[PDB]
Write a protein that holds these residues in place. Sequence first.
Motif, PDB file in Angstrom:
ATOM      1  N   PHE A   8     -25.704  34.625  -5.242  1.00  0.00           N
ATOM      2  CA  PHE A   8     -25.430  33.460  -4.365  1.00  0.00           C
ATOM      3  C   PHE A   8     -26.633  33.315  -4.007  1.00  0.00           C
ATOM      4  O   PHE A   8     -27.299  32.545  -3.376  1.00  0.00           O
ATOM      5  CB  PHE A   8     -24.591  33.911  -2.823  1.00  0.00           C
ATOM      6  CG  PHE A   8     -25.111  33.747  -1.956  1.00  0.00           C
ATOM      7  CD1 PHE A   8     -24.077  32.098  -2.213  1.00  0.00           C
ATOM      8  CD2 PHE A   8     -25.626  33.243  -0.626  1.00  0.00           C
ATOM      9  CE1 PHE A   8     -24.129  31.267  -0.834  1.00  0.00           C
ATOM     10  CE2 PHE A   8     -25.191  32.676   0.377  1.00  0.00           C
ATOM     11  CZ  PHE A   8     -24.704  31.458   0.040  1.00  0.00           C
ATOM     12  N   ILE A   9     -27.433  34.352  -4.346  1.00  0.00           N
ATOM     13  CA  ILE A   9     -29.114  34.415  -4.137  1.00  0.00           C
ATOM     14  C   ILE A   9     -29.592  33.670  -5.087  1.00  0.00           C
ATOM     15  O   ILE A   9     -30.867  33.323  -4.509  1.00  0.00           O
ATOM     16  CB  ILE A   9     -29.680  36.283  -3.982  1.00  0.00           C
ATOM     17  CG1 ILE A   9     -29.659  37.037  -3.145  1.00  0.00           C
ATOM     18  CG2 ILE A   9     -31.529  35.580  -3.864  1.00  0.00           C
ATOM     19  CD1 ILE A   9     -29.267  36.749  -1.405  1.00  0.00           C
ATOM     20  N   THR A  10     -29.394  33.802  -5.974  1.00  0.00           N
ATOM     21  CA  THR A  10     -30.065  32.633  -7.163  1.00  0.00           C
ATOM     22  C   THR A  10     -29.889  31.277  -6.574  1.00  0.00           C
ATOM     23  O   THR A  10     -29.990  30.587  -7.463  1.00  0.00           O
ATOM     24  CB  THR A  10     -29.387  32.723  -9.115  1.00  0.00           C
ATOM     25  OG1 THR A  10     -28.086  32.928  -8.167  1.00  0.00           O
ATOM     26  CG2 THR A  10     -29.787  34.729  -9.047  1.00  0.00           C
ATOM     27  N   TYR A  11     -28.687  31.058  -6.129  1.00  0.00           N
ATOM     28  CA  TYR A  11     -28.276  29.736  -5.849  1.00  0.00           C
ATOM     29  C   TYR A  11     -29.009  29.531  -4.046  1.00  0.00           C
ATOM     30  O   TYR A  11     -29.636  28.325  -4.208  1.00  0.00           O
ATOM     31  CB  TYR A  11     -27.101  29.733  -5.293  1.00  0.00           C
ATOM     32  CG  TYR A  11     -26.399  28.770  -4.592  1.00  0.00           C
ATOM     33  CD1 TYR A  11     -26.926  27.755  -4.839  1.00  0.00           C
ATOM     34  CD2 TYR A  11     -26.316  28.960  -3.378  1.00  0.00           C
ATOM     35  CE1 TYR A  11     -25.788  26.050  -4.089  1.00  0.00           C
ATOM     36  CE2 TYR A  11     -25.622  27.903  -2.437  1.00  0.00           C
ATOM     37  CZ  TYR A  11     -25.713  27.160  -2.824  1.00  0.00           C
ATOM     38  OH  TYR A  11     -25.564  25.554  -1.454  1.00  0.00           O
ATOM     39  N   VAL A  12     -29.428  30.248  -3.907  1.00  0.00           N
ATOM     40  CA  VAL A  12     -29.965  29.625  -2.521  1.00  0.00           C
ATOM     41  C   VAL A  12     -31.392  29.534  -2.120  1.00  0.00           C
ATOM     42  O   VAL A  12     -32.005  28.119  -1.775  1.00  0.00           O
ATOM     43  CB  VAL A  12     -30.062  31.052  -0.857  1.00  0.00           C
ATOM     44  CG1 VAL A  12     -30.745  31.663  -1.393  1.00  0.00           C
ATOM     45  CG2 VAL A  12     -29.969  30.438   0.314  1.00  0.00           C
ATOM     46  N   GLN A  13     -31.974  30.177  -3.318  1.00  0.00           N
ATOM     47  CA  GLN A  13     -33.671  29.305  -3.729  1.00  0.00           C
ATOM     48  C   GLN A  13     -33.486  28.563  -3.831  1.00  0.00           C
ATOM     49  O   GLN A  13     -34.647  27.749  -3.336  1.00  0.00           O
ATOM     50  CB  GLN A  13     -33.566  30.778  -4.597  1.00  0.00           C
ATOM     51  CG  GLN A  13     -33.345  30.330  -5.987  1.00  0.00           C
ATOM     52  CD  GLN A  13     -33.390  29.605  -6.791  1.00  0.00           C
ATOM     53  OE1 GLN A  13     -34.576  28.607  -6.710  1.00  0.00           O
ATOM     54  NE2 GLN A  13     -32.515  29.103  -8.199  1.00  0.00           N
ATOM     55  N   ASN A  14     -32.446  27.254  -4.862  1.00  0.00           N
ATOM     56  CA  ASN A  14     -33.091  26.088  -5.159  1.00  0.00           C
ATOM     57  C   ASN A  14     -32.188  25.562  -3.923  1.00  0.00           C
ATOM     58  O   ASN A  14     -32.739  24.305  -4.107  1.00  0.00           O
ATOM     59  CB  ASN A  14     -32.134  25.489  -6.355  1.00  0.00           C
ATOM     60  CG  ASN A  14     -31.165  26.596  -6.571  1.00  0.00           C
ATOM     61  OD1 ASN A  14     -30.529  27.416  -7.378  1.00  0.00           O
ATOM     62  ND2 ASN A  14     -29.996  25.302  -5.486  1.00  0.00           N
ATOM     63  N   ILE A  15     -31.462  25.426  -3.083  1.00  0.00           N
ATOM     64  CA  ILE A  15     -30.935  24.605  -2.445  1.00  0.00           C
ATOM     65  C   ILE A  15     -31.421  24.546  -1.128  1.00  0.00           C
ATOM     66  O   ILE A  15     -31.999  24.026  -0.582  1.00  0.00           O
ATOM     67  CB  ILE A  15     -29.952  25.339  -1.755  1.00  0.00           C
ATOM     68  CG1 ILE A  15     -28.641  24.142  -1.288  1.00  0.00           C
ATOM     69  CG2 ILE A  15     -29.489  26.088  -0.594  1.00  0.00           C
ATOM     70  CD1 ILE A  15     -28.016  23.432  -2.422  1.00  0.00           C
ATOM     71  N   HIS A  16     -33.057  25.641  -0.358  1.00  0.00           N
ATOM     72  CA  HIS A  16     -33.776  25.598   0.198  1.00  0.00           C
ATOM     73  C   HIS A  16     -34.937  24.814  -0.488  1.00  0.00           C
ATOM     74  O   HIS A  16     -35.625  24.419   0.113  1.00  0.00           O
ATOM     75  CB  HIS A  16     -34.270  27.213   0.391  1.00  0.00           C
ATOM     76  CG  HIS A  16     -33.023  27.822   1.580  1.00  0.00           C
ATOM     77  ND1 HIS A  16     -32.796  29.133   1.556  1.00  0.00           N
ATOM     78  CD2 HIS A  16     -32.538  27.098   2.167  1.00  0.00           C
ATOM     79  CE1 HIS A  16     -31.839  29.162   2.708  1.00  0.00           C
ATOM     80  NE2 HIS A  16     -32.139  27.716   3.361  1.00  0.00           N
ATOM     81  N   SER A  17     -35.500  24.523  -1.713  1.00  0.00           N
ATOM     82  CA  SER A  17     -36.151  24.021  -2.458  1.00  0.00           C
ATOM     83  C   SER A  17     -36.182  22.697  -2.208  1.00  0.00           C
ATOM     84  O   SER A  17     -37.209  21.945  -1.684  1.00  0.00           O
ATOM     85  CB  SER A  17     -36.086  24.153  -3.644  1.00  0.00           C
ATOM     86  OG  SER A  17     -35.407  24.187  -4.396  1.00  0.00           O
ATOM     87  N   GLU A  18     -34.537  22.244  -2.572  1.00  0.00           N
ATOM     88  CA  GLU A  18     -34.210  20.412  -1.932  1.00  0.00           C
ATOM     89  C   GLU A  18     -34.552  20.553  -0.599  1.00  0.00           C
ATOM     90  O   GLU A  18     -34.932  19.621  -0.622  1.00  0.00           O
ATOM     91  CB  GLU A  18     -32.740  20.122  -2.509  1.00  0.00           C
ATOM     92  CG  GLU A  18     -32.174  19.762  -2.205  1.00  0.00           C
ATOM     93  CD  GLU A  18     -30.558  19.348  -2.634  1.00  0.00           C
ATOM     94  OE1 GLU A  18     -30.821  19.882  -3.549  1.00  0.00           O
ATOM     95  OE2 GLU A  18     -30.104  18.813  -1.844  1.00  0.00           O
ATOM     96  N   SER A  19     -34.453  21.365   0.537  1.00  0.00           N
ATOM     97  CA  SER A  19     -34.108  20.748   1.349  1.00  0.00           C
ATOM     98  C   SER A  19     -35.625  21.408   1.736  1.00  0.00           C
ATOM     99  O   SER A  19     -35.985  20.719   3.305  1.00  0.00           O
ATOM    100  CB  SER A  19     -33.519  22.104   2.075  1.00  0.00           C
ATOM    101  OG  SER A  19     -33.461  22.371   3.274  1.00  0.00           O
TER     102      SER A  19
END
Lengths: 206, 948
Positions: free
Chosen positions: B873-884
């Motif tokens: 999950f942490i490896t994924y939340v880093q890119n979804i917040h970069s997009e956001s």
Amino acid sequence: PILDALSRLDLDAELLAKVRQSAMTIVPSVKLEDLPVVIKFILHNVKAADAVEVISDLRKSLDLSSLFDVIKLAVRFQKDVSEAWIKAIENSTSVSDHKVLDLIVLLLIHSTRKQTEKVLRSKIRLGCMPEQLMQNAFQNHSMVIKDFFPSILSLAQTFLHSAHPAVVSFGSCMYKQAFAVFDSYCQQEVVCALVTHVCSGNETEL
Amino acid sequence: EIPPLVYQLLLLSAKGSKKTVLEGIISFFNQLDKRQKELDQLRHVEGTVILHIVSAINLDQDIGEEIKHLKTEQQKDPGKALCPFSVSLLLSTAVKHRLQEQIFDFLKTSITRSCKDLQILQASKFLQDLCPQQYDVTAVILEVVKNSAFGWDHVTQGLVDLGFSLMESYEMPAQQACKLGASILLETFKVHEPIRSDILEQVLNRVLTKAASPVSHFIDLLSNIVVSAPLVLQNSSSRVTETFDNLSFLPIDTVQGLLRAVQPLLKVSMSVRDSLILVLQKAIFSRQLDARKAAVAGFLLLLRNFKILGNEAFCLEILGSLRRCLSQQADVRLMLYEGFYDVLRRNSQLASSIMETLLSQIKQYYLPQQDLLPPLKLEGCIMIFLQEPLAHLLCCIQHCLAWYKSTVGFEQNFEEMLESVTRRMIKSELEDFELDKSADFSPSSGVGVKNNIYAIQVMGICEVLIEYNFKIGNFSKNKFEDVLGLFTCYNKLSEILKEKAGKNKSTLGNRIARSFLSMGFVSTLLTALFRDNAQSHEESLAVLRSSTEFMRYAVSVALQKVQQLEEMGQTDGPDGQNPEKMFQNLCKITRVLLWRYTSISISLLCLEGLLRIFNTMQQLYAARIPQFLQALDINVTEKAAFQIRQFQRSLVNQLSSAEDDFNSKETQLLITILSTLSKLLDPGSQQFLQFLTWTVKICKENALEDLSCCKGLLTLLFSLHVLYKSPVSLLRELAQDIHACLGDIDQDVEIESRSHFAIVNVKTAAPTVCLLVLGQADKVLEEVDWLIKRLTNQTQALEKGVILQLGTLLTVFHELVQTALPAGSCVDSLLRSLSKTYALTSLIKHYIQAVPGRLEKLVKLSGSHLTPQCYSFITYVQNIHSESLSFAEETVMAKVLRDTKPIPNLIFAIEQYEKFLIHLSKKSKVNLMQYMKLSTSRDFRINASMLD
């Protein structure tokens, strides 16, 4: 008489503000038997955000002169101004050198509590409040001893046993001072508290 | 042989050891009492041994600290430490002046823990299922007073001190503390004779200087104890005289309740009556708003304090006081208009004088001119400000005139001038009015607010005469058209001008402004309007029914009244304080409200009311539910099951309707109406089940795209499947659907397109549901912490449920952390909730004291279902917040140190749980780490190539 009438009369903000600054300007200029009605009025009649500094102005007014128990009753009549007093002495002791009136009103608000003892602990860890002033207070103003009020002040030593043991010594000193004045029943109650101390707890307070 | 035994034990404790003697004696008397409860010769000896023990602790103070044993017993297993004799002994020792605070705060934490435990058990039957052992300290502490009727003095002193500090420590567990304190104080006052004066003194000294906290408890228990024993105050030499100074602290409701309580003692005692009359006489002419409010509040009660309707100087002398007070401001002129009817229900000729005074008052603004230009003397009520609330005065006039007419020179004049006014309003339209301009109103202007107060005042003027013509006329067509014209003037001036230029800039949450109608009148109006068709009807309602605008107002007033009964405990109009009276009114209006809904917006109004009748019924008239339930035509469930069934039929028809006919406002109310009516269905009924299986099956089939509709319905399902079974089964199924509905955390393996619920579609899997599921999951974890706290022969049963539930709960988060959640708060909730479930640590930390195979399987599950998935999950939340984060102004420091803060906390929670496994693995001689994998960390490298 004007302030008594305005006490009797209703209140409007625009006039109340200017007349109340005028009052604060004319509180200390009069004899100690005359301002108490003004203080009572501004206590039970006026409540606002600016009171947090109006009471500091009152403290400066009463700093010099420090039977005159009407002020105590006036502070009893309302409690929000007492919380404002706690907030003001939170910073009044941060600059002023803990005048006798500060500790007197602190005892009064602690009588009428949790915020008062939190402030007491914070300044215990901060500046330890040189206690010669309160020694003079108990020497001259012992008419309001009434041990039930300073009893919590003494038992605060138990919470102050985790660290800073010197303040425990200061509390012991001020209970030594309060014992040798009057109130033989209060004296025997103090001795009862002391025998409680030698009975329960570890050898320190023993 | 028990007195000699206790004698040798305290002789031994006086000089020798004192450790296990107390435990032995308390256990022995515990079994003795448990035998006895299944008499006097036992009570006397128990009092003697209690006195011996209190003497022992007085002389030998070292036997009380060995409080430690009780605290350790409570910590080992909560509840089984506050035995009735143990609590009686510590209660007796509580007045020792030594070690009071330690014992006292032990009792405080024990009782608050017990009340919280009872709250959880009443909020969770599953905990009742696996933990049937309940220890309700309220009952045992209210049983001591039952046993304290045998000359126990220091026990009573301990009881009263405990209650005093209970009200002190109050300021919902705090409300439960108030209830317990009131109960114990009432019991110790009722049965203990020589201390009841002390109790009265304590409660009198405790009420003063107490206004910031809700202090209604003081007045209510004082009323209870004086209605049980009114002679105590006279026994205390009537120490209530000093309390009259309370006119300056907070006389909004405390004075009214205090006078209500002391009413019989004021009546019997002339001295207190004289003190009250003199204090109020000096208070009335004080020119303070607060003092005048206190004075008029006291006047509202003193007139009815004395009864002569079925000493005449006393009657006639009080007449002029309120007449003189009438000259004051409008704000203090307000409440007298409302309170006049209450005392007018209690007099014959005083009523005539009151009518004459009110008539002289209304002549001030009547302008007798015989049906010409409108009688608007509102110019006097300008000192931007308002001087007299004409609407309230007119309402009081109408109500008092109706009372006088029903009871059996100026009265004929009174009727004709009222009739003249009604005939003048119908002839005075918005052309003779000064407020004919559509925009003369102007906020923060010296003239606009003057128009506004004129505008609001006339609205009340119209409403009052609506009541008059409807009541003075009886199926008379001539008066009905007058009502139409009155509302015609009302709507023409209320629908427009105001709420166009007056105040509508913010969307009006409420409806037609504060109404001055009678709950009795609106009940008669609706009952005569709907569900009424007889020959006495003079075809007037036929043309009245054409006024659909009148229809909306006719019910919106009722919604205002019962809302007053919702937010507050009273309402307006006559009979606003007699709870049975509106109960009958509510019993009557509900049927026609239901009939209007079932006759076939307008019905949206009545249905919204029903939601608020049921809400008010449970929240206020809890003891009066059975009659109200039977009034809709004894077991409440069968009638309740009938009531929901008709509501069920409305929902299933409404939900099955097309999306063009969804009228969402109806759906929210009807869903909430079930969530309120389903509260009182009893646990031991089958109808619980088929209803519960119905809302499940309606959830499996229906596919609703509304958001608040899904949120409201789910709350009902989780507010009922929380007192019958374990909700984790439902939460898992919801998590099964969310993961199936949304994508995947790794976006590489495709989840099978299952659908456990049809409500969750491509849209509803948004924070709409994912925040409710995590909300329920947090609740389950919250009580598990309590179970873990309780866990730290009955112990084995506790561990069975916790491992089983956490095993299911882990399957919930495992299938939920693998969900491809969208950005926003739903991601943030999961990261924090994951930090909660790991804090798994406490259960591991407890079992360090011991290993069992079931616990090892849990860690096997936890290692293979949470941690490796959690790091993904942490490896994924880093890119979804970069997009956001690219959508910034398309400082930023707020949005970079707020979407990433949970990540370090989650790492810490994982390692702390990981660290305590190290301690167990070494100590428990079993390696339980082959299941899990190595901890993974992350680094970075600033891409200086793409720096700019």
